[PDB]
Each structure stands twice: as structure tokens, then as C-alpha cells.
Amino acid sequence: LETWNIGVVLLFTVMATAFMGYVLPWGQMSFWGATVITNLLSAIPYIGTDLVEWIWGGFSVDKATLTRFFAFHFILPFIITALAAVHLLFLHETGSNNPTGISSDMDKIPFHPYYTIKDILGALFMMLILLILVLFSPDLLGDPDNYTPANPLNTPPHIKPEWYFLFAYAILRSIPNKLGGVLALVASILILILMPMLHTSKQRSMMFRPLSQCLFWMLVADLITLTWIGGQPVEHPFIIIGQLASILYFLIILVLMPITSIIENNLLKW
Amino acid sequence: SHTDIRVPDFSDYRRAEVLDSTKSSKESSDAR
Amino acid sequence: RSFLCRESLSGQAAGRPLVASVGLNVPASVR
Amino acid sequence: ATYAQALQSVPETQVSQLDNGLRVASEQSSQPTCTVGVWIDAGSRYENEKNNGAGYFVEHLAFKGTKNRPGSALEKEVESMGAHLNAYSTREHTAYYIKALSKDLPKAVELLADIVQNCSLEDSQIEKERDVILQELQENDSSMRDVVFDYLHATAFQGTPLAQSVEGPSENVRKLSRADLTEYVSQHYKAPRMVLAAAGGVEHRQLLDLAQKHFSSLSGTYVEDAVPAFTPCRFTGSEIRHRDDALPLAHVAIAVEGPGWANPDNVPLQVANAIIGHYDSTYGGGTHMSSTLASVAATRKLCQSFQTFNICYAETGLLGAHFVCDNMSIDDMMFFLQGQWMRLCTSATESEVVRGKNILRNALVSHLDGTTPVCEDIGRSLLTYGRRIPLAEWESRIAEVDASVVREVCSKYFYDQCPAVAGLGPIEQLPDYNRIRSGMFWLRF
Amino acid sequence: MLSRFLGPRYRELARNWIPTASMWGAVGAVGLVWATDWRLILDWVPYINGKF
Amino acid sequence: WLEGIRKWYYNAAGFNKLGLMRDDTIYEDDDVKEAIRRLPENLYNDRVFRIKRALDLTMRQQILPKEQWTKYEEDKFYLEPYLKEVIRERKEREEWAK
Amino acid sequence: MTNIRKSHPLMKIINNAFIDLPAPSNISSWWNFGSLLGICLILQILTGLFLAMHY
Amino acid sequence: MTNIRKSHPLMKIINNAFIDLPAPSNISSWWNFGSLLGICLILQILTGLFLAMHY
Amino acid sequence: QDLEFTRLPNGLVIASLENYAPASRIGLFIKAGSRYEDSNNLGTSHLLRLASSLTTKGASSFKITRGIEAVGGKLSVTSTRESMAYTVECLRDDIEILMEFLLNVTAAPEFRRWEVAALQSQLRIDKAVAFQNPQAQVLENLHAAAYRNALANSLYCPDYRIGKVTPDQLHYYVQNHFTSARMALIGLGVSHPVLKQVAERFLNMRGGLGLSGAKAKYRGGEIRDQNGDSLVHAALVAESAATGSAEANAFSVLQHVLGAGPHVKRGSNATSSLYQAVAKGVHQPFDVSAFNASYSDSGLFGIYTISQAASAGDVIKSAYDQVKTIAQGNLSNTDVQAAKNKLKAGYLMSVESSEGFLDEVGSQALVAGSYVQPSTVLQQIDSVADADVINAAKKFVSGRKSMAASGNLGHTPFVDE
């Protein structure tokens, strides 16, 4: 539980860092997306409007917002490093979990002789992919509209965040109410903290719960659908598809998984 | 030998209320 | 226990068989 | 016949009063044995610095020689009928009770009269008795429980006669001559401050005329004018730390100022002191005893034995707990025990209050079986409360107290009150005094 | 959980701790109004509305 | 009837392939570790050997051969009585607390 | 004499962290990403510094 | 059950580093300049960040 | 308001007395103990004595502890060499619940493996705590060196059996020495009807007499250990006679003739012949007292001594010599009368307390099966004559003797001298 909560905090901090950093090049997409995302905080009741004046450093996103975003983008990754150290401490207290879910205390191997070179191979593969992206398709995921001076006199054809932001932004799009949209957006990540409570199956892992495996893959496909919808404009039929997938996300996480776990336990004499 | 153990006199540091050795300390504990 | 006195030693000389005894919320005792 | 019906039966404690002031109290019953004793108000509380320890010396020499009885002839007579004569001198009272059969009552009263009245106090016996007290002083110094309580008394009531040890410092016992003892006997063994108690096959009328025919010579005179006066003592929240690492275990006793002998708040307090309870390693309950602190201690084998005491003198008393544990448990219990107090101070429920009520009722009823406990109860109650409180009244007071009463009483006694901790042994993990005092209050309440 | 907190002694604890927690809530509300200088509340209180 | 569905699920679960009985797969919460401690010596030794062999197998990613799989009718709920006793004791303590 | 690996404080922490820390044998590749994240953190931070040197 | 101060991981480090750390009983004011330095870090870091948001 | 000494057909004998006391105590006395232990199950009785709170058939350990504590009563399992006494007590309005808990503990234990394994360490803890006082070791070695078997067994688990007593041994001990014919339920402050109902309701399940023990035969050993205590504890004792006999009362009178126990606190024991006899000579802290242990099959009478290491030779000798004088017709009639008065007082004084009366009735029910009024016991004590006392002294002097010693034994004389 402790490692999971610290991981959720790390994930929050990483999203904030990336959102903030994408402003720094000050392209058309950077400034316009920043305006939209920060203006989303206006939906907060009472204080909310003042908050967007506070974050902007004025009436709208301007140079003060850019420099404060730069400073916060500098400081935050070191907070991420400290939180990662704490996350590792919490995990190291109890030890990692094997895919089976059964305690592996009887069969434990030293970390240095084995799980250093394996991580070396993993990091090398990650570098293979990353330099493939950098050296052959540099501006692949990034929108070309960033390579344009940020002109506040011209709204871009479509204002969209990064591919790793389009799913929660599509969730925001799905809900009609502005405040409810922000609530759904924050809940779409905060729901990870509820996961320790929603577990009801007697087996910790999923290797022996095929129905839960199908539900998990349905959830993964739903997230892919959210990302694709967030990429697309809010038109027919993208509106209905995005809405339905947004409902199915929470419905799977909160309802289908626990009920499936109850049926799972009942199917195994226990 | 333990009977020979005695607490030294703290009257140099004691507050005015607890200075006397006859009156109790509960009534002055509130004010202190 | 130190028993370096005749008067303090009085009664320590047992004269009846040992009888063990332990309670549930009472400390164990012997005689 | 339910508890209430059996409680009323409770043969009474008819109390009379001789013209000399000796209040003769008895408790008739059916057993053929009896306990007759004289409870005098004489202890370390009345002793001064110069003669501290005279009471212990007089208790030692009481059975030795009594003029009319030449000496060991007293022992011969006492052992002739199988009577067991015993004396216990606490910090306040001092009693000489004969544990004998009912038929030997006329002789037993005479023997007690001989001891309390006509004592030879021979100088040679004083010299012989001087060594014994010094030896007993070394034995008490070896007594690792007695010395921590003496330390608590010294550090709490510092600068007051209460802090004086019952036996006395091992300097007065090497200087106390016949003159000091005779003054102590004259000024403290007075008829008004005496209770002639006897429980068992004792007829109250018989005890009355035996006292009249034997204890008449006692007078309430006080020489010219010198009248000893009870001097109220002050509770001084302090700390004494006698760290001796060679000792195997560590004794720590923590107490705060509590009630007096005559104060209703005594009844709820014991109930609270029953909730915390007591534990020893050889209990058997282990991880299941309802007392939270006891269960916690048994789960981790924290202590070897913790108990809660309710030492209560006339105007003030000591309320707290004495626990014996290894070196690296003193901190933990100091966190836990205090916390328990805090919980009892903060949020107490009727369930554990009822449990404490039942425990206190059981303690009172079971403590009062046999002739000697009843005789001791009569002798102490007449001197302290001015009367023997019947068990029915105790039942009424215990029925009155509930969770709100316990909470308010503990708050008035425990909450944010400076303690009087006193340690012995390898006391190093024992938290600093400011840590203990800070533990006395809870930042949530 | 749900049932294990649904007991008589648990509601006894709740009743015991209602005053302290409730007026801790007042402590927090007063501290928030103080820190933010909330003119909606601070206007009504006397001798402080003069600061506005 | 339902037992066919139960057998199909047991086949599709996976821990029968790894030579694991049912109780080897249960998450180890406080009740479960206390019950495991409460196990007799022989059952505990067989359990730990089975778990270690399964972890080896999934490390190598080799399912245990077909013939000596844990059959449905040969699956024994060894942990179940101890776990039931542990749960009953915990429930009794909680009722006393309430 | 004692091991500098498990007696020196910094080295003791490193040893208990990722030298002699017991680990499950059947850990799949899905856990490697953890370390990858740390790598993808450092490889980020360093690069960011250089970017901050011309921004 | 047990004290969180000496059982929680982070709280254990804080407890044995700053709360229950056995320090010498007679350290003078000169030793206090240690803590000031750390404070003079934080007090100056927080300010230093706020200039970075307008510089 | 009297003792109704009913006995059931199965063998259980119920005694009760409605004293109308505020508190009530119910005790089950079982004719089981160390003497019925064998060479294999040594220390099982100690575990059973420590086994008073484990999960029973109809009451879990947590339930038993919580119920007994909330009711406020207690549960003590005081045991002897040949009898184990379970006893509960509390206010008279709720003795039903504690009596049922006791009944489950006695006649329905489960002895779960995990709980017994956890309890194993309590054996070592209790043995150490009880052995802190030197008298326990000396008496245990006396019993080891006095009888070949049976009574030779210790009340405490031997070091090699600590952690080895399995629940199977406990179950064998239970349904081999807890049958109805060898137990007695005695109640103080309880009515006979309810006691009879609970007796015929639960304890009737274990019928029969059970596995009989074995007779104890004198071995005349001299078990000696050099513990290193400053005070040497010694005990020289000969087989006196079985309890419940004329020789038993004669030896009991001889015990007080010799002197046993200081009546006056911090006294000199003038009447005690042993104390005065040894007082001449040695001039260092010393105690000597007659020692009597009247077990059912056989009894032990002798001298117990706590003396200085250097003087241990004298105190053992002179005290023994005193008995010789009593053996060779040197007992005054006045001394016999004084000893008889002391014995009568002691008997009427042990039964004075409610617990004393409880264990007295339990012992009478278990051993003799016929409770006699205290006046009858006093009459039997008065029936003893001087010739019987002088043995009794002859039997102690002539018979072979077992000796036990502890401390610095560099000067303790051996049994051969």
C-alpha cells in the first residue's frame, strides 16, 4: 500500500512536470494547450477563477507563466528523485512480488549477480527504441504545430496535448459539466489509490484469474480508445465513442473487477 | 544504604508557591 | 534474597512438602 | 441468596470507645480462631530527622522484654497456646496483633497490653537489636522492589517527613539510644490514637471489659504540652535515577499525587487502576488478557512484571505504576503505560469500566477472608476513615461510578500532572523527564 | 471496515471524541479564515473589519 | 450443471499446470500467514517445496509436464480448516471488541 | 576486519539496496521497467541540464 | 500495537536522526551553527526558487 | 449451612457449603500429579498445570480469558505431588459462568499443537521463577533421593523435556488420570443442587478409575549439589509413615515437639527444642525446623536446616543429636501438651481462610473420602500419647535416611556420618 501510494504521487508529479515542460519551447501548441489546461481550473467553484490568475501570473499565459513554468520544471524532477528513493525504501522493506503472487521467501537470489545485467539488457533495449525514435523519426509523436512561434492571435486547427495526455483529456471532454469534467479528469488517475481496497479475490496476482485477465485487457483497450478519441476532434461519432469508453473505464475498474473477483472466489470452492 | 539516599535541597530554584514544605502543590499547580 | 540475619532467616526453613501453584491473573507461587 | 443479600449479612463491626480514648472494635463470627491487635498511629510520617527510624527500633524491641514478662517468657507464653504474634510498622500506622484461638482471648489481650504499655526497652537488648536492624537494612538494599518505592517516596515528598524511610537512614540506627525510643513511645503510643481490634470468635462485650480491665492504665496525657501534630506534605514532581548497570533487570516506578484516605475520588481511581491491571510473566493469559497494556507487554515480552499501586496517606497519596523490565523496554512501556493512562483520561467506555468495577468488587471481597485481614481492615479503617466502611457502602460507591466519572477523575488526577518517576538498575533507555512530562498530555485532546 | 466499526463501544468512542474533533474543525476553520483574510467572514467580526 | 464450469475454470486457471494445489495460490494476508504458521510440519514442507518448484518453473517459463498435473478430484484443501479456525478466532475477538 | 561493502554506511545502504538484496527468481521483464524508469529519469535529468544551459 | 515513531520506515529515520538521537549534554552554542546552515539552505533555497520565476 | 458430602455412582464426590459469603469458590481436586508420571511423560503434569487457558471444546482461549477477567474471578491450578486442584472464584451472582469454564478446562481440553508449542517456554520461565528460592531445589532433590519412583518425580518439567512434551502425552494424562472416581468437586458459597447438576452433566463423560500409579519405595539417596549459595540448605529425612494413620499424627506431634515455624516474628523460638539445642554451640545465622510430608502411600519426617557454609557440619549434627535425646525418653508431658496445642491451633488456623477450608475439604474427599469435622481432628490429635511420639522419634533415628544438600557443601557431613 505505501509503495503504491508513493507511486501514485510520483505519477502525479511526472504528469505535472511533463505538462509544464511542454510549455517551454513556446510553440503555438505549447501556449494554446497551456491556456486551455490552465483555464480548466476556472471551473473550480469560488476560488477557482482567482487560481487561474495566480497560476498565469496575470490575466493569461504570458512571460511570467513561461518563466515560472521553467523554474518549477527545473525543481520538480529532484522531488521526483526523492520520492523515488522513498518508494524504493518502502518496497525494499517488504520485497518485490513475483508474477505468481505467492511469497517467494523460500526462493530468493542475490540482486547483484543476476538482476544487474538483466536490467542492463532492459536499459539497452530501451535505449535501442529511444535512439531509434530520436535518430529516425524525431518529430513523430510531437505535433508539427509546435515548430511555429506562439501567436496568441490565431487559434490552432485542433488543440491537443501529448499522446500520454490524450486519454485523461478525452475523459475531460466526455463529461459535459465543466467542474465534473475536472473531477473526472483527476479521478481517472486518483482511482489507482482505490485499487488496494477494491481487491476481493483470494489470489493477489492475475495468472490464475483468466476472467480478470480478460477484464484487464478490456481496460487496456479502453485506455487505447481514450487516447485515440482524445486525438480526434469532438464530433460525431467521436463524442459518443469517447463518452461510452469513459463510462466503461470506471465501470470496469470499480464494478466489473470486484464482481468478477467474487465470482472468481465462488468458482474455486472458496 | 538506600535509606541514606536523600534528595538535595532545591529551594534555590523552586518557585515561590512550592517553596513552603507544608502546603500541597495541587492548588498552585494550576497557576504554575 | 540476602538473609544475613537470624531473625530475617526465621521461617525460611521449610517443614511441609512443596506445593506448586499458578493462576490465570495471579502470579505463580510455591510452598 | 444473591450478592446483595450476602453483602448485608456481613456481621457488623460494633465500635466502642473507652474513657481513655481507646476505641475498642470487634467483629463477631463463628470460627474458633481470632485476631486481636492494637493499631497505633505511629510511623515515619511523625518521626523527625534526628530520630528517624525509632518506630522500627521500638517494633523490634517490643517482643523482647516487657518488664512483667521477663523476656523470652513472653515468647514461651505465646507459643504455649499456638498463638502467632506479629507486628507490621508502615509509614503511618504500627500494629501488634496476636493470631490466636478464641478461648485464649483473655490472655491475648493481656499480652498485647504488656507489649503496648510496659516495655523494658533494655539497653543491652538495644545494643543487640542495633546490629539486626543494620543487617535488615542491607537485606532491604538487596530488595530491588522496596528500594525503588523508597526512592519514589524520597523524590516525591522531598523535604517532608513522608519521604523519610520507615527503617530510617543507616546513621540514626547507630545513634538511637534509650532516651530517644522512650520519648517516641511516650509521645506516640497514646490511648486516643489506638484501636483495639479483634475479629473471629470475639464477643464485643468480652473485648470491652478485657480492655477496661487491662488497657485502663493508658492515658492521653502529653507531658507538659508537647503534642505531635500532623504536618501536611507537599508532592514535588521530580525524578531520581540510580543507574546500576550490574543489576539484571530494571525497576521503574512512576506516580502522581492522588487522593487522601478520606476522599470519594479514591473509589473511581482504583476502578481505573483495575482497568490497567497488573501482569507477571508467570500469568498464562498472555496475549489474551483484557488489559491493553498487559496484552501488549505479553505479546512482545516487553516487561517481566508491571503492577499498579494506590498508596494513599491521610492528606495525599501516590497513584501510578511500578514495572520491572529489561534495559530496552523502559522506553516502550513509558510510551505505552502513559498512553493507557491517556486513553483512560481521554476516552473510556462503559465496558472496561464495568470490568474494573467487577475486578474491584472481587478484590474487596476476596481480600476480606480470614480473621487477620478483617482485623487489619478494622484497625486501619477506624484510624483512617474514622469508621469501618461496610461492604454494602463499597458496593454503593462502585455502582455509582461509571465511564464519565472515571474520565473526569483521571483527567483531574492524571492529565497534565508532573509525575514522580524513580528508577533503579540499567535504566538508560528510560526517557528524559521532559519526555515523560510531555507524555502526560495528548495533543489530540 | 463497515461492520467492524459498527459497534456499541465504537459509537461510545465517537461520542467521546465528537467535542475534540468538532472544535478542532473550528480551529481549522478559524485558521483558514485568518490565513486567507476571508473578507466574507472577517467583515462581520468586530475590530477586524477596520483593516478593510 | 455447475461442476462442469468449475472443472473448466480449474483447467483454465493455470496453477494446476505448475503442480500447485489450490491453497498454494492464496494471497498471504495476516490470517493466511498465521494459518501457514499453524500448519503441521509435513504439510508445510510439501507446501514450500511445491511453491519453490512453481517459482522455478515460471522463472524458466516451462509448464510442468501433462501427466502429473494436480487433478480436480485430487485437489485437497489442506489450509482450509486452519484458515477457517483463524477467521473464526478473529471474528470472535472483533465481536468482543464491539 | 569487516566487509567495506556491508560495513561502510553508504556502501552498506547500496549493498542492501541492489547488491545483496534478496529478489524473486521468477521476476519477468515487466519489473525491469522499474529500473528503466530510474534510467529514464537520469537520462532525462542530465539532458535537461544541458538544455537549461542554452535556454 | 507499536509506536509509529520507531516502527514506520521514514518515521524511524526521523526519530533516530532528530528526535531520539543521543546528543552530548553540554554542546555549546557553537554546535548550533550546524542546524542554522541547513536552515540557511532551505530559507535561501525557497527564496532562490522565487527569483527563478521572474529572472 | 452445613457440609453435604454426597458421592455419585460414577465416583465423583460432591461437597458443598452455603456460607452465604459475598464471594464463592468452586474447586475440582483431581488425584493426578507427579507421582503418577512415568519415565517417559515426565513433566506432563507441569504442562497441564500451565495448561489452564488453552482452547477447550466449548470455549476458545480468548473467550476463556476475556470471560474470566470480565467477570473478575480467578483460576488457580495449585498442584501437589499427588493432587492437582483447579479452582475458580468470584462474586456469587455469576459463579455459573466461571464454573462452566472450569468444567470445560478440566473435562474437555483440545490441546492444540500450536498453543502447546507456544506454551513450552512458559515451562522454563515458571521453573526458573520457582527455583529462585533455594527451598524448591532442596525439596525436589530430597524427593528424588528419598523414593525410587512415583513421589520422586518433580513438580517441574526436567530440562531435557522442556519443549518435548507433545499433546498426545497431555491427552493420555487426561484420559488416564482425570476419571470420575479420582476427582472431587468442592464448593464454598454454592448450593448443592446446582453443583450436582453440573457434576452429572459434564464430568460423567470420563467414567472409570483410570490408570493406577505405582507404590513409592525408599531408596535412601544422598543427592548433593554445589550450587554456591552462601547459605547451605540441608535436609535429612527418614520414611515416617503413611498419612491418615496413628503414626502420622504421632509424627505430626513430634514435628511441633522438635519445633517448626517461628510463632513470634523476629523471635528466638524458645519452645522449639531444635532451635535451642542448636543455639548452644553455633553462634551464626542459622535455622533448623522439623520437616513432615505425609503423602498417601508413604511419609517423610526429618530435619531441614539453613546454616552458614562453615557451620553446616555442626547444625546438621547437633540438631540430629537433639532428636536422639527425644528418642531416648526425654520428652516432658508439658512439651507434649504444648505441641498438641500448637497442632490444634495450626489445623484450625489453616482451615480459617475460605481457601484453606476449600483445600482441606478437597484433600479429605480425595484421600479419605470421608470428611470429618474439625473437632474430630482435634480429638484425634489429643488421642496421641507421649510413648507414640518418642516410637516415632525412634523410627526416625533407626531407619535409613535420605539427605539433600545445596550450597557450598565443603563442610556438610554425609549421610554415612
Ligand code: HEM
Ligand atoms: C518515478 C517513476 C517510478 C520509479 C523510478 C519507480 C521505481 C520502482 C522500481 C525500481 C521498482 C522495482 C522494480 C519493479 O517492481 O518494477 C518499483 C516497484 C514498484 N513500483 Fe514503482 N516506480 C515508479 C513509478 C511507480 C508508479 C507510477 C507506481 C504506481 C502507482 C508504482 C508502483 C510500484 C509498485 C506497486 C511496485 C512493486 C512491484 C512489485 O513488487 O512487483 N511505481 N518501482
Ligand code: HEM
Ligand atoms: C522528470 C523528467 C523530465 C521530464 C518528463 C521533462 C519533460 C519535458 C518535456 C516534455 C519538454 C518539452 C520537450 C519539447 O520541446 O518537445 C521539456 C523541455 C525542457 N526541459 Fe524538461 N523534463 C524533465 C527533466 C528536466 C530537468 C531535470 C530539467 C532541468 C535540468 C529540464 C529542463 C528542460 C528545459 C530547459 C526544457 C526546454 C527545452 C526543450 O523544450 O526542448 N527537464 N521537458
Ligand code: HEM
Ligand atoms: C548554494 C546556495 C546558493 C547560494 C549561496 C546562492 C547565492 C546567490 C547569490 C549571491 C546571487 C546573487 C544575488 C545578487 O547579486 O543580488 C544569486 C543569484 C541567483 N540565484 Fe542563487 N544561490 C544559491 C542557490 C540557488 C538556488 C537553489 C536557486 C534556485 C532555486 C538560485 C537562484 C538564483 C537566481 C535566479 C539568481 C539570480 C537572481 C539574483 O541575482 O538574485 N540560487 N545566488
